[PDB]
Coordinates of C-alpha atoms and ligand atoms in Angstrom, one line a residue:
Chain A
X1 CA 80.3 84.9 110.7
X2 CA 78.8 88.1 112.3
X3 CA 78.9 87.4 115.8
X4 CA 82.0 86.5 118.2
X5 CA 85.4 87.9 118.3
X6 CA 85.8 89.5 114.5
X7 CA 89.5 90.9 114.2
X8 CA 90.0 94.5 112.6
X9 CA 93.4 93.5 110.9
X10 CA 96.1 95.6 110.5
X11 CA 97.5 96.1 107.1
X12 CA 100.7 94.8 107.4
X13 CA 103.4 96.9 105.4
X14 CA 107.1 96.8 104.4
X15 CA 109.4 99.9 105.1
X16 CA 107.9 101.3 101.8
X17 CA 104.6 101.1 102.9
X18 CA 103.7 98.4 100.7
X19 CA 101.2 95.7 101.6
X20 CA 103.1 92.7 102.9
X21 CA 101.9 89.7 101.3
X22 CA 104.2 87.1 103.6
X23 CA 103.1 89.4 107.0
X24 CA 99.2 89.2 105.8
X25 CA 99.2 85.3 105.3
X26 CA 101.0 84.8 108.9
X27 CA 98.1 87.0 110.3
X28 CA 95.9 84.8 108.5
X29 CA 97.0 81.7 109.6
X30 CA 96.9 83.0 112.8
X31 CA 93.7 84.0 113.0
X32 CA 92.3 80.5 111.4
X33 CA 94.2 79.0 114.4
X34 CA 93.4 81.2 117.0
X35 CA 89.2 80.5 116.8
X36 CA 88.8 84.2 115.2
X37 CA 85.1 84.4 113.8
X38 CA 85.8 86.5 111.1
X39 CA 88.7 89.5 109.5
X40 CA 87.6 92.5 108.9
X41 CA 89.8 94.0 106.0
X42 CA 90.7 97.4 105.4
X43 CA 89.0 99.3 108.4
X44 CA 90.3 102.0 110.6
X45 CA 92.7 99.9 112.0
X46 CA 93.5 97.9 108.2
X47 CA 94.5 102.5 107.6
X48 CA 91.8 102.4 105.1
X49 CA 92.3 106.2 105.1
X50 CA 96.1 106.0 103.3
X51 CA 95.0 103.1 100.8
X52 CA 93.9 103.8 98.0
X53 CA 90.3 102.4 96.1
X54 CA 92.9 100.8 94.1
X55 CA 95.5 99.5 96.9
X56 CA 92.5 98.7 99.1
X57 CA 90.5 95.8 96.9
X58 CA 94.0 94.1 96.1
X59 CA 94.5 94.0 100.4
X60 CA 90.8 92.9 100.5
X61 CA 91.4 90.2 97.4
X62 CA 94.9 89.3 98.7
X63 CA 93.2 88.2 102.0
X64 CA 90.6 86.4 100.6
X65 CA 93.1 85.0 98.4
X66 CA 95.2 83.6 101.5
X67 CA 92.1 82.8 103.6
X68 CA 91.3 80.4 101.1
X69 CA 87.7 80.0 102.4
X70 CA 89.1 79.3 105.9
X71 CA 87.5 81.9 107.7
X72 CA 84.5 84.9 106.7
X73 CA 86.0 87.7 105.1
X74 CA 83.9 91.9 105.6
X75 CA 85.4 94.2 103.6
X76 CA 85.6 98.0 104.9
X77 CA 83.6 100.1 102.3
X78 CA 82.5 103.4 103.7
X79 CA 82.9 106.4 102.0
X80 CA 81.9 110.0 103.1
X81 CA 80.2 110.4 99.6
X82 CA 77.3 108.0 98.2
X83 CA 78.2 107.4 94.8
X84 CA 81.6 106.2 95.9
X85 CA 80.5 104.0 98.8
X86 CA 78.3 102.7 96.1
X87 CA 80.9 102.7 93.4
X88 CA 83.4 100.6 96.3
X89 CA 80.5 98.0 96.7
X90 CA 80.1 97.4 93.6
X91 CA 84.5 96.3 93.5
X92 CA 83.3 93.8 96.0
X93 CA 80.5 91.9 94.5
X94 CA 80.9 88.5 93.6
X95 CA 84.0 88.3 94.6
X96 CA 84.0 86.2 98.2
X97 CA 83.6 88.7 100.9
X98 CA 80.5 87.9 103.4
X99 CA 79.5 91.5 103.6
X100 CA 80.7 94.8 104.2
X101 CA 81.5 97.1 107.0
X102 CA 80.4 100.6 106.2
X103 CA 81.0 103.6 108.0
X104 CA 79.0 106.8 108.8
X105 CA 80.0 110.3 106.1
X106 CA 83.2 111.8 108.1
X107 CA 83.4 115.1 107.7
X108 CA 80.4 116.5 106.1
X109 CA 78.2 115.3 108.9
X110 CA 74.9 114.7 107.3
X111 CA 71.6 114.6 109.0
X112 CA 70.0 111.8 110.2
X113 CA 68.0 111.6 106.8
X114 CA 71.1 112.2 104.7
X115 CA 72.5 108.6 106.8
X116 CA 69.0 107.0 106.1
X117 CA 69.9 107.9 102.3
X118 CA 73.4 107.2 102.2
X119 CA 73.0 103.8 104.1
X120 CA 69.9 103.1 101.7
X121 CA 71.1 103.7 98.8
X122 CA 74.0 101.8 99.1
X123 CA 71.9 98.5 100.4
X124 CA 69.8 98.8 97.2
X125 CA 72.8 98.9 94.6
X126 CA 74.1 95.1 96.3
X127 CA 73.5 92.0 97.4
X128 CA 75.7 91.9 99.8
X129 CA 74.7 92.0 103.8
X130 CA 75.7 95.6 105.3
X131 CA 77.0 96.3 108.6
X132 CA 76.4 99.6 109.1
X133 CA 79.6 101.1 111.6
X134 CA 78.9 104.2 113.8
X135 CA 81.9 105.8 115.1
X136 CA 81.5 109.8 115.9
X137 CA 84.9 110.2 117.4
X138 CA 86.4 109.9 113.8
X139 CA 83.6 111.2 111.6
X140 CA 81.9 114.1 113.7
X141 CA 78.9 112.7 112.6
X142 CA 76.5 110.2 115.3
X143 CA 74.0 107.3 113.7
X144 CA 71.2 107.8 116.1
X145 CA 68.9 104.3 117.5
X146 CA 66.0 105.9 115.5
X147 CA 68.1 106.1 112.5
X148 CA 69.0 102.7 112.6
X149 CA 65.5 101.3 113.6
X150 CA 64.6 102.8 110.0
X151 CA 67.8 101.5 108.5
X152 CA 67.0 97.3 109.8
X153 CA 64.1 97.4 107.9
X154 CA 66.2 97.4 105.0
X155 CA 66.7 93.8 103.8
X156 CA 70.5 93.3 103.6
X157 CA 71.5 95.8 106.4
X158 CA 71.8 93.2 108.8
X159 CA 73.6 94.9 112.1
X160 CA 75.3 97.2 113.8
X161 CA 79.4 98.1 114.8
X162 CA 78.5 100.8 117.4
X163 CA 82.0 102.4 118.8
X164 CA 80.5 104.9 121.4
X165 CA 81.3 103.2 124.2
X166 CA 78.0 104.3 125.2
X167 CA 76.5 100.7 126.5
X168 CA 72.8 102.0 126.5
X169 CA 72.7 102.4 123.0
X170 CA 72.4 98.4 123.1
X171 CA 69.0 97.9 124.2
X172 CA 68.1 101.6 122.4
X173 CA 68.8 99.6 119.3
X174 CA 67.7 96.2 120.3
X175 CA 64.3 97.7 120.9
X176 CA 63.8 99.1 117.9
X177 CA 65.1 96.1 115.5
X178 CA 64.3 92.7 115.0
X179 CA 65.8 89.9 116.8
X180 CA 68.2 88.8 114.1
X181 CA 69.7 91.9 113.7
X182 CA 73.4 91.9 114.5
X183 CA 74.8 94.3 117.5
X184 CA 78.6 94.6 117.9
X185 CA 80.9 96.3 120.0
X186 CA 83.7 98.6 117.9
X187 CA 84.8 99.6 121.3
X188 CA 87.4 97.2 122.9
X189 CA 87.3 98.4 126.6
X190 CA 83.5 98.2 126.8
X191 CA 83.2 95.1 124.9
X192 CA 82.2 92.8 127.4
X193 CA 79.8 95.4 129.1
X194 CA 78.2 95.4 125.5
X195 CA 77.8 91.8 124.7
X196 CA 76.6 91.4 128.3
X197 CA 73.9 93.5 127.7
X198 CA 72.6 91.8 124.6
X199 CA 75.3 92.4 122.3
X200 CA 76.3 89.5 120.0
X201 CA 80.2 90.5 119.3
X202 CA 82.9 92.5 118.8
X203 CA 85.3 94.1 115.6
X204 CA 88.2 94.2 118.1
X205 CA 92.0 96.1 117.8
X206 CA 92.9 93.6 120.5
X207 CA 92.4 90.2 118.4
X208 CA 95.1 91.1 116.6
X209 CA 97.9 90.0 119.2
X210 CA 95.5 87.9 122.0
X211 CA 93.3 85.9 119.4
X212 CA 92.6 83.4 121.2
X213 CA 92.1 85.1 124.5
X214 CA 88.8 87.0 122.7
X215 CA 87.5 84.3 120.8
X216 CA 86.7 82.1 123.7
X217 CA 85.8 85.5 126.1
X218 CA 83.4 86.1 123.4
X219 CA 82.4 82.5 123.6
X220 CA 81.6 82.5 127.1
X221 CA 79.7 85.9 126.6
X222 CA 77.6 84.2 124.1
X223 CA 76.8 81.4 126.6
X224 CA 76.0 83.6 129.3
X225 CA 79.2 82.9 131.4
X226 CA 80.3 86.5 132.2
X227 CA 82.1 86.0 135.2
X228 CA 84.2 83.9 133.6
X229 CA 84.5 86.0 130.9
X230 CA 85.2 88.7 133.1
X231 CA 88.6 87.3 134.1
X232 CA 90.2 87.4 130.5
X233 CA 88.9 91.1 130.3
X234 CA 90.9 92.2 133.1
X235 CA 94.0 90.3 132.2
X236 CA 93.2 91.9 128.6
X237 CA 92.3 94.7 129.9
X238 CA 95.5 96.9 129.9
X239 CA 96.0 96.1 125.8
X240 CA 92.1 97.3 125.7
X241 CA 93.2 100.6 126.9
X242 CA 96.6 100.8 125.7
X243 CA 96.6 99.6 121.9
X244 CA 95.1 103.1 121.9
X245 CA 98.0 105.2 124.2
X246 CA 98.7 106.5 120.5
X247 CA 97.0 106.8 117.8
X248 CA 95.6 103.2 116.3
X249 CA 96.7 101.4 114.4
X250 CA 100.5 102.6 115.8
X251 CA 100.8 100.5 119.1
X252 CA 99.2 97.8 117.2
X253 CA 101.5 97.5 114.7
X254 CA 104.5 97.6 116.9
X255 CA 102.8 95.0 119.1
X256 CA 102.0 92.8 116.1
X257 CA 106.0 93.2 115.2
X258 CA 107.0 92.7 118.8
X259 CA 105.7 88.9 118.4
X260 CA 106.7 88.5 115.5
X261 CA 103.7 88.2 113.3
X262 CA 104.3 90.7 111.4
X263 CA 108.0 92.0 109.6
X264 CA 107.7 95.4 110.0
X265 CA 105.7 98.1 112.1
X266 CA 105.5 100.9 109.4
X267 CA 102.3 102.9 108.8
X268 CA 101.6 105.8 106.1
X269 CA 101.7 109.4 106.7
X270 CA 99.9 111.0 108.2
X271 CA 100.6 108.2 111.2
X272 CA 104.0 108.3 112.8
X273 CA 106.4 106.2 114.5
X274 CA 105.5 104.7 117.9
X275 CA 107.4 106.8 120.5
X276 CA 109.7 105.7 123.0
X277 CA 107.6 106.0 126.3
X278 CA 104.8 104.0 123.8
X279 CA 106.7 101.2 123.1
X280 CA 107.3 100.8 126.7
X281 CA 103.3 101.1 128.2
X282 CA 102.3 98.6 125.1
X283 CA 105.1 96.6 125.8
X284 CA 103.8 96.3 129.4
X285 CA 100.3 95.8 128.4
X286 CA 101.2 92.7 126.2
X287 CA 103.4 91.1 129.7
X288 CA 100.1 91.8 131.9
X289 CA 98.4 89.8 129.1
X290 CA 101.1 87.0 129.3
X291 CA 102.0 87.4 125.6
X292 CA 105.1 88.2 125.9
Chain B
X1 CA 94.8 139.5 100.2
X2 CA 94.8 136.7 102.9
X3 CA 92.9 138.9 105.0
X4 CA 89.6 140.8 105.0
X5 CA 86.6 138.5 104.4
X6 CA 86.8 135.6 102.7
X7 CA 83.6 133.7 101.0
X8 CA 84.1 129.9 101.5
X9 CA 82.3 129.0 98.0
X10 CA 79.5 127.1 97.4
X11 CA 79.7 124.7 94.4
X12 CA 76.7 125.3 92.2
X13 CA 75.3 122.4 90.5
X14 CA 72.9 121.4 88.1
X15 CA 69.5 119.2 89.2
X16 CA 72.3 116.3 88.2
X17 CA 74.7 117.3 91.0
X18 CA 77.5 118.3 88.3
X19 CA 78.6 121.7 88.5
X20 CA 76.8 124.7 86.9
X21 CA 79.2 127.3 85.0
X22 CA 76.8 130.0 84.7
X23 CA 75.8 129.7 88.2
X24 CA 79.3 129.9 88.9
X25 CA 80.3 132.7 87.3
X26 CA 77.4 134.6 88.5
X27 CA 78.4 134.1 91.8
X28 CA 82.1 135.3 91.3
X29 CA 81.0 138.7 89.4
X30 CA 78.6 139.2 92.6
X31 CA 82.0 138.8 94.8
X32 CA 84.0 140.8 92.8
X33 CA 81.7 144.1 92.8
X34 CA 80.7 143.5 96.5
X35 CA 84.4 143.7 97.7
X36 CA 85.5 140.2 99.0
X37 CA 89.1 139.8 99.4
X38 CA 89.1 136.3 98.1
X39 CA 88.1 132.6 97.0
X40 CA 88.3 129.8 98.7
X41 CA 87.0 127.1 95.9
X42 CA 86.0 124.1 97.3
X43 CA 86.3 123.8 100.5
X44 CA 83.7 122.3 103.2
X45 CA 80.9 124.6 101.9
X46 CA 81.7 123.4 98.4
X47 CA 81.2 120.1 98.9
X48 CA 84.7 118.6 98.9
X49 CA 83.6 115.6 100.0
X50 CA 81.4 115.2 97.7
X51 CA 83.7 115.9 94.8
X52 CA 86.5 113.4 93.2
X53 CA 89.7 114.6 92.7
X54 CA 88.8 115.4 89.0
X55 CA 85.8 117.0 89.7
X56 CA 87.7 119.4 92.5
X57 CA 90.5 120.1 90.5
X58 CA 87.9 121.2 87.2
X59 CA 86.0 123.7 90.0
X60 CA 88.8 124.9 91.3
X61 CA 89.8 125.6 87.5
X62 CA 86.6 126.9 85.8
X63 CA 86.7 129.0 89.3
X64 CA 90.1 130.8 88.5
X65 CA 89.4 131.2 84.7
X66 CA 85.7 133.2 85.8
X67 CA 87.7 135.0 88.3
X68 CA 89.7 136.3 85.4
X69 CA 92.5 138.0 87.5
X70 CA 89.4 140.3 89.2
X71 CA 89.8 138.9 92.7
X72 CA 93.0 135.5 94.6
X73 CA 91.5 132.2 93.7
X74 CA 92.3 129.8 97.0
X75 CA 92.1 126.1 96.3
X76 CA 90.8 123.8 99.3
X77 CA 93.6 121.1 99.1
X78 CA 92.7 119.0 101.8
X79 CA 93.2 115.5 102.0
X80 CA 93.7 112.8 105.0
X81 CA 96.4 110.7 103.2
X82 CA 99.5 113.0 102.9
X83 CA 100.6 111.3 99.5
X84 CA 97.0 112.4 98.4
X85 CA 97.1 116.0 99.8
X86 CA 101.0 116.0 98.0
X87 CA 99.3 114.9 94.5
X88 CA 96.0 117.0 95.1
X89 CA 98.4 120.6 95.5
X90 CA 100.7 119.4 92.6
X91 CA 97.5 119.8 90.2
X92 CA 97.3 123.6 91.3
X93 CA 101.2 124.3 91.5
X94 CA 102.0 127.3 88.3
X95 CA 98.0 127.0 88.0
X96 CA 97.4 130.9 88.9
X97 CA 95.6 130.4 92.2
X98 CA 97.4 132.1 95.3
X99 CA 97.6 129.4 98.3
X100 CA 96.0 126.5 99.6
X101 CA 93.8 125.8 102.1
X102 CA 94.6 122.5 103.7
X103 CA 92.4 120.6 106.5
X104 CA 94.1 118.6 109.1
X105 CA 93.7 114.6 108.7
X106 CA 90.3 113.8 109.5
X107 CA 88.9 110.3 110.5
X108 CA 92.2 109.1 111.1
X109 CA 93.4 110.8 114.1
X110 CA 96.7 111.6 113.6
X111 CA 99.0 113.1 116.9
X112 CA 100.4 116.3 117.2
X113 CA 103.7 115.0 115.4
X114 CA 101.5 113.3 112.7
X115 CA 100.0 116.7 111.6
X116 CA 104.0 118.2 111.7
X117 CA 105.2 115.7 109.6
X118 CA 101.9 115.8 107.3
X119 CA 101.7 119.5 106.5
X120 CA 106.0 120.2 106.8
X121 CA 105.9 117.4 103.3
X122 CA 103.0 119.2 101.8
X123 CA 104.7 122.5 102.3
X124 CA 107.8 120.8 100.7
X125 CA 106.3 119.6 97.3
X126 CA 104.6 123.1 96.5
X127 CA 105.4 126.8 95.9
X128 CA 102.2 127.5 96.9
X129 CA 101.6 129.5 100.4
X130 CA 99.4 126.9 102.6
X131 CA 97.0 127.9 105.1
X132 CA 96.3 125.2 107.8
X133 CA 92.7 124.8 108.9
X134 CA 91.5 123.8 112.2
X135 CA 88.0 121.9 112.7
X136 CA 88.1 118.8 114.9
X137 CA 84.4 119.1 114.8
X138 CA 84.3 117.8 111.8
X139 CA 88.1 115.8 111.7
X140 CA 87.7 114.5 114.9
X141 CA 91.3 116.2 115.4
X142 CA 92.9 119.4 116.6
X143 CA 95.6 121.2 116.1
X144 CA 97.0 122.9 118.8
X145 CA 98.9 126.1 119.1
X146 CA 101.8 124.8 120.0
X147 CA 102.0 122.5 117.3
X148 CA 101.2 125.6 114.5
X149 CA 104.0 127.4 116.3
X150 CA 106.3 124.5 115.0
X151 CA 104.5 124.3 111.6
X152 CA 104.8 128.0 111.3
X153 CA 108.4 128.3 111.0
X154 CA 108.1 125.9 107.2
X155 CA 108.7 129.0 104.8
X156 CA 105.7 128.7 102.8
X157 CA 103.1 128.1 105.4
X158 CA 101.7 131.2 106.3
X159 CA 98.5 131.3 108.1
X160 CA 95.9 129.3 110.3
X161 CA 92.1 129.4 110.0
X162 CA 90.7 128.7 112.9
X163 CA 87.3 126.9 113.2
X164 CA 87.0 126.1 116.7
X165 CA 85.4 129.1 117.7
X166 CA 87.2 129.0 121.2
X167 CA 88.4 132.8 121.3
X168 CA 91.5 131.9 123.1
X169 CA 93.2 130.5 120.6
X170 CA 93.9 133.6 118.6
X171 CA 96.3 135.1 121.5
X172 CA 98.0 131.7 122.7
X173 CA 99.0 131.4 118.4
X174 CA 100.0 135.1 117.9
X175 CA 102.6 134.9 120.9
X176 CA 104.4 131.5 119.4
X177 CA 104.6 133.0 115.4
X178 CA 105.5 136.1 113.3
X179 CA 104.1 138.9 113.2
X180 CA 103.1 138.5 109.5
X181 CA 101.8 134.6 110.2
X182 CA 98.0 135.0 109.1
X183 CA 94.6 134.2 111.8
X184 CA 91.8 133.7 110.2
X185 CA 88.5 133.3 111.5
X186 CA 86.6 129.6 110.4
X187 CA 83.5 130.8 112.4
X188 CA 81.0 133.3 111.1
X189 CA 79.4 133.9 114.7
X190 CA 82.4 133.8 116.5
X191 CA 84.6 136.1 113.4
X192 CA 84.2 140.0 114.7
X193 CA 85.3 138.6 118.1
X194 CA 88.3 137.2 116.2
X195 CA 89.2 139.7 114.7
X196 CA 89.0 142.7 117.8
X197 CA 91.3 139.8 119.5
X198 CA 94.1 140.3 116.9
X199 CA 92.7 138.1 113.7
X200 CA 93.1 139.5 110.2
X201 CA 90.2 138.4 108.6
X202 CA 87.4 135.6 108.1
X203 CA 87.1 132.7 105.5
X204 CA 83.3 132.9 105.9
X205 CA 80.1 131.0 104.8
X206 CA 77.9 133.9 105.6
X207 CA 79.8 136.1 102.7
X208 CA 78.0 133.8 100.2
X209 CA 74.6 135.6 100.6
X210 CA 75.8 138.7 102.3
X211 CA 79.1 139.6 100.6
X212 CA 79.0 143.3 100.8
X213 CA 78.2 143.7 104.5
X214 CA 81.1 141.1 105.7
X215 CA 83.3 142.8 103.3
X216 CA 82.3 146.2 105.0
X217 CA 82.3 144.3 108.5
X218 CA 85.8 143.4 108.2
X219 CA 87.4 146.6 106.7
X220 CA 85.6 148.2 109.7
X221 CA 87.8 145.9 112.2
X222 CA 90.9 146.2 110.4
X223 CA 90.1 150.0 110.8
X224 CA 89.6 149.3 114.6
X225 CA 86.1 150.6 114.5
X226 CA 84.7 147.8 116.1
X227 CA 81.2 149.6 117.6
X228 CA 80.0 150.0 114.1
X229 CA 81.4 146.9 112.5
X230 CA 79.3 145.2 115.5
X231 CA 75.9 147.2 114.1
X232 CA 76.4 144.8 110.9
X233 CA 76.9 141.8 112.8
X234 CA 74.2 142.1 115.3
X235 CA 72.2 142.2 111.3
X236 CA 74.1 139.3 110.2
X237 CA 73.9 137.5 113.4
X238 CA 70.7 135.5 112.5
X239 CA 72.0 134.4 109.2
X240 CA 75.9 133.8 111.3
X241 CA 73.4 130.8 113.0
X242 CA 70.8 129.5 110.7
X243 CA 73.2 128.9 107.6
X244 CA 73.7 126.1 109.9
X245 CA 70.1 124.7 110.6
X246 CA 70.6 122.1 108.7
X247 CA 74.1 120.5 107.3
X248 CA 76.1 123.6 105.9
X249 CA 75.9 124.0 102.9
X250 CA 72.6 123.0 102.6
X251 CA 70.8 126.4 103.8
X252 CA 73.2 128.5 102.4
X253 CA 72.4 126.3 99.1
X254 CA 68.7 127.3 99.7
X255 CA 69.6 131.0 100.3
X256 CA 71.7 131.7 97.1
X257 CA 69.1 129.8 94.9
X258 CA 66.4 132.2 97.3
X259 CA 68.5 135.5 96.5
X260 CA 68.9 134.3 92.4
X261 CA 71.7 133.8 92.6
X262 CA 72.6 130.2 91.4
X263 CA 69.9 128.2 89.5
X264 CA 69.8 124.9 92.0
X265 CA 69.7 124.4 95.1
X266 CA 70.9 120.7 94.6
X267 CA 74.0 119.0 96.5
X268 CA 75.3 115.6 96.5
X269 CA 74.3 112.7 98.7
X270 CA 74.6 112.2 102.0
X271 CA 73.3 116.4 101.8
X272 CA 69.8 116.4 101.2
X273 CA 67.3 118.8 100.4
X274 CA 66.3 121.6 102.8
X275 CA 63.6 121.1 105.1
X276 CA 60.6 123.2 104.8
X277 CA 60.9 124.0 108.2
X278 CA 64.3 124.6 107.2
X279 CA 63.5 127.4 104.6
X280 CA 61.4 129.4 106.5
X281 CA 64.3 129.4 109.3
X282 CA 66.3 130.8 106.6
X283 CA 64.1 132.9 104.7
X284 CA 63.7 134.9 108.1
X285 CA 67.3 135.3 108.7
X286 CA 67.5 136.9 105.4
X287 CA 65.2 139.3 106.0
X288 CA 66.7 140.2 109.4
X289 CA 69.5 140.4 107.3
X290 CA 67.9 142.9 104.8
X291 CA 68.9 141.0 101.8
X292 CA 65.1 139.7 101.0
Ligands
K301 K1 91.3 106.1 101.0
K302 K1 86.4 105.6 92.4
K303 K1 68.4 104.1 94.9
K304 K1 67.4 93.9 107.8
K305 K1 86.1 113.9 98.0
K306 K1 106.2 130.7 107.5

């Protein structure tokens, strides 16, 4: 439910840019199949950037909708201002999610204390577990081990999403926190380092086109069996490095269309169509992983 | 003007966090009778993020109506969803203020042709002159000369302000536009280098407590006496640094509420209150400054 391979699903849309309901539920269905631990909906990767508030719960209720109690739904929640994060969580409650994914302030790059308010206050206006998602490539803001040794004690912030790629901050956090306290990769190449090193899962880009692949390579991490584990990373390894050749979620989407799962490859502005040369180097990627 | 020194507002607000008129207009009588060229009203250092789109729009507003035709009103339009950033400038199109400053995507990541296609449509659905504005500190993007040579040739966009702080970029953009396309300075420390490299002026956060000396500082480099405009930066040099201490606009909150010139220091969450430590950091820049 928090640990194991957990998908950052794409949002799939028609030419319009419209949520696609018939795309989502093949997704879905796929993911049930496929051993996926849980979806996240409406991260990065779901463009929770170009939804709106409004656009953004009907994706998140449309998917629990078509789950249909199948598989543990996180909604993404952050917001770079407290009140709305707040406001967001508050959409959410009650409604069948299993917690919330929540991102560091973009933008106006807070302190540490201005995260240990923002993170806070949003714990105390819900019931809802928190996963609390550090990713300062995106937000030009970084959720320090300290910070998030604070933040644990907090009864319903229950983990961590940390997308650094920098593996020590696993056993900086693990140190600090309790040993129920959630770590999971955000970063797909460095994954398995991460989980090796005490992590307990991954909120992967890659799930989205080798399900099945991650679940059980995130299965034999969890049971210790890393050398076996190791040998799905490398044949997984290419799409690790590039589903990200251009902007996410663009070779994603075009990957996900490529088999099929979804009808159409469109994003919003500001991303763009998948260049030529992209569509090529994805394309190989998927062969090396023998799905296509 | 879209030139000479700029003052990158603070929002004033009220112990609740809503916006304080008479602080306000206080502020924009002290720019117009110290000399500053223009307004930008909310931007980064007044709390866009913080601010709905309601909220913004009624600032930027109340701003132009105290401005009372005395001094160029520029609204901060930006927005990391281009149908957002579209709708956002549409509320200020026949409003009365001059141009728009408008923030690359940030979180999201766009590529080079992502940022084209996003400003070219914003451009396309306004009247309003548009200034791009560079910060992939805080966007976790950048936009590189190249692509503003591209972006440059859209009729109504008309100038760049540059936050980067890398000195380079000035020259590399002035060879790939007209002669009449806009640098400004996003830098306060970095700004009198700017400018005796070719810039035309600054879009500071320094002019909120020192407006009369950056407005003489940057008539001074337009004038190409640059020994003496350095005598008043070497003053302001301090204050150029510790306005960011702490998360701008947090000191420079502190300072204006120090000089008397709003009523509250207060800001919106995840900003917090200035350290103590914080203060006296600032109070001594001040003085450097000759201001207290
Ligand atoms: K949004
Ligand atoms: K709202
Ligand atoms: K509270
Ligand atoms: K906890
Ligand atoms: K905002
Ligand atoms: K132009």
């Amino acid at each position: 439910m928090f640990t194991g391979s957990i998908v950052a699903i794409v949002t799939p849309m028609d030419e319009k840019g419209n949520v696609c309901r018939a795309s989502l539920k093949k997704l879905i269905d796929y993911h049930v199949a496929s051993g996926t631990s849980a979806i996240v909906s409406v991260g990065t990767t779901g463009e929770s950037a170009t939804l709106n508030h409004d656009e953004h719960a009907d994706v998140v209720m449309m998917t629990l909708d078509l789950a249909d109690g199948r598989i543990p739904v996180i909604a993404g929640t952050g917001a770079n201002a407290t009140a709305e994060a707040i406001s967001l969580t508050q959409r959410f409650n009650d409604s069948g999610i299993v917690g919330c994914l929540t991102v560091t302030p973009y933008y106006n790059r807070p302190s540490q204390e201005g995260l240990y308010q923002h993170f806070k206050a949003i714990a105390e206006h819900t019931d809802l577990p928190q996963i609390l998602y550090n990713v300062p490539s995106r937000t030009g803001c970084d959720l320090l081990p300290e910070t998030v040794g604070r933040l644990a004690k907090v009864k319903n912030i229950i983990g961590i999403r940390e997308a650094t790629g920098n593996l020590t901050r696993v056993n900086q956090i693990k140190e600090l926190v309790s040993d129920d306290f959630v770590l999971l990769s955000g970063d797909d190449a460095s994954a398995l380092d991460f989980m090796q090193l005490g992590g307990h899962g991954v909120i992967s880009v890659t799930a989205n086109v080798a399900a099945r692949d991650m679940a059980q390579m995130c299965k034999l991490a969890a049971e210790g069996h890393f050398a076996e584990a190791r040998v799905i990373n490398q044949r997984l390894m290419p799409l690790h490095n590039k589903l990200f050749v251009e902007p996410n979620p663009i070779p994603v989407k075009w990957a996900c269309k490529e088999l099929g799962l979804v009808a159409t490859d469109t994003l919003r502005l500001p991303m763009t169509p998948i260049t030529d040369s992209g569509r090529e180097t994805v394309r190989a990627a998927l062969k090396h992983a023998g799905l296509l």
